[PDB]
Design a protein around this nucleic acid. Sequence first.
RNA 1: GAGAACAGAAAUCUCCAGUAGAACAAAAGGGUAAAAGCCCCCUUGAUUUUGAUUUUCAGUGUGAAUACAAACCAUGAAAGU
Lengths: 40, 296, 169
Amino acid sequence: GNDVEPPKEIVKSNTSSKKADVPPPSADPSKARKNRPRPS
Amino acid sequence: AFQKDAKSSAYSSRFQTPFRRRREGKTDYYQRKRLVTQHKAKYNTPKYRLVVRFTNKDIICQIISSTITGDVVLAAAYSHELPRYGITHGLTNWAAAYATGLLIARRTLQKLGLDETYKGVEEVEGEYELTEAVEDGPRPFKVFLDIGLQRTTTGARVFGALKGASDGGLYVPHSENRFPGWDFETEEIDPELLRSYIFGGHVSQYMEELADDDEERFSELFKGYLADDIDADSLEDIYTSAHEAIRADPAFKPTEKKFTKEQYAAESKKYRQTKLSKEERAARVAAKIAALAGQQ
Amino acid sequence: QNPMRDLKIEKLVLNISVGESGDRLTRASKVLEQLSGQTPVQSKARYTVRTFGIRRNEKIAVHVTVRGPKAEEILERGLKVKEYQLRDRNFSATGNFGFGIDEHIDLGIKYDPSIGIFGMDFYVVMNRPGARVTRRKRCKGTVGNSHKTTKEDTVSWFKQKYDADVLDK
RNA sequence: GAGAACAGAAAUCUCCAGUAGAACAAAAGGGUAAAAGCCCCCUUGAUUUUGAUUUUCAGUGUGAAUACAAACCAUGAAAGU
Ligand SMILES: [Mg+2]
Ligand SMILES: [Mg+2]
Ligand SMILES: [Mg+2]
Ligand SMILES: [Mg+2]
Ligand SMILES: [Mg+2]
Ligand SMILES: [Mg+2]
Ligand SMILES: [Mg+2]
Ligand SMILES: [Mg+2]
Ligand SMILES: [Mg+2]
Ligand SMILES: [Mg+2]
Ligand SMILES: [Mg+2]
Ligand SMILES: [Mg+2]
Ligand SMILES: [Mg+2]
């Protein structure tokens, strides 16, 4: 008794002219850091 | 202006400013060129544009031809002129745009001579038609609809003004796929709906749609419609009567003298500030050098 | 001197950076859907890294833009989760602000293990009235310095409303 | 540049600045910002007929190109292209 009585596909479009499949100039391991926060 | 963003002397020097009417986001030159430019083998026949603009709730309808020294207006009709013919509120509605279109149509036709001839369509049933030429007679005046930067959407008031001018008698080459009542998929137009929009069937339907569901919003929206004892039923006739009044008199007479321009120039020069003298600023900087660098 | 320089919320955009495509993404999408009521938008990967295991145009993310009272609603629904406590950071020098929240069930939304639990980036973009000049077609212009959002002025507005927090340098 | 859970130099989201520092198959040089670039919608004018014109030149040919005439079409509200 009384026992408890996918969305539409919208895809964003990019305004960047670039169409090559290569990382940007900022995506370079150089700018990482030595002994960064690293939660332990 | 974050200091990390300020522009350098080189940037400003090597920067190219666009045309003033572009920097003011007012003229689409890529469109103006193709509308104004005329066939080089006719060589004086001006391309007449029917500029239709929309101020915030006020319609402008001018007929212009371009000139190397500046566009010249042939005829001009502002929707704010409708009181004369019989309309008082909302002169931004589709019916107001159609009214102004018909107004300028007859106005220019009379200013030209094609008044008795090319009377346009009077019994406006909301049909799709163009002002056809007369057998063994002068061809109708032809103008091209200049919507400026307006975004062409199916069923807009810009095209309403278009319908008004065409129905008035002007020859404006035009399609029908952007007239309210155009069926997106099926290729059929609803003239009952178009006629409705020409008269106010949507505004009138809104009036009697709010009159018995929410008098609290109809209270102020449409306030004047009640302040002048007039409901939805009436609307079609106010517009039709305005149509008859315009076709009867397209005259445009202007505003009364009303404190003539020299007087206006004076009462406004009072607020117009004029640049300072070079010696004035010279001393204005000398005073600052004395008051700031002179140890207080 | 402001009788009209009153700070409204332009939009609130929620964003799940689901690192890959597939079922996980259609699920984060369905979450966004019954968090907004509007069909969310999917975001494709710009380039390919392969350390993150993604590919160009992979459809690896989803977001949704909500404006008005609904935005205030979800904004408060998340402010609660964060105990009305933000930092001097998290604010754009341009006036806007945002936070992040894992544990998306803290927003009222039930568990439903057929979808899992997901995190979400909350970004609120604020603006005074008349911001339409920068976003309209005709006469698109720039708003005066005194009229556009500031970081200090926005944190002050944020503190005054809900008295929530500042918390550090 | 400043900002947002995992998220890190590099994932996705937002705002600000941004004369082009991009992109436009390819070599380079021109050219291009409500475009010539990016997203989208509709199309087959990359079609039919025979002439003229520019470059190379003998003012031959070929290649390429330009502006009209006569058709039949595409697109757009449209001028137009
Ligand atoms: Mg792109
Ligand atoms: Mg960008
Ligand atoms: Mg210098
Ligand atoms: Mg255009
Ligand atoms: Mg004020
Ligand atoms: Mg991964
Ligand atoms: Mg090149
Ligand atoms: Mg071919
Ligand atoms: Mg040679
Ligand atoms: Mg020879
Ligand atoms: Mg030979
Ligand atoms: Mg030859
Ligand atoms: Mg040949």
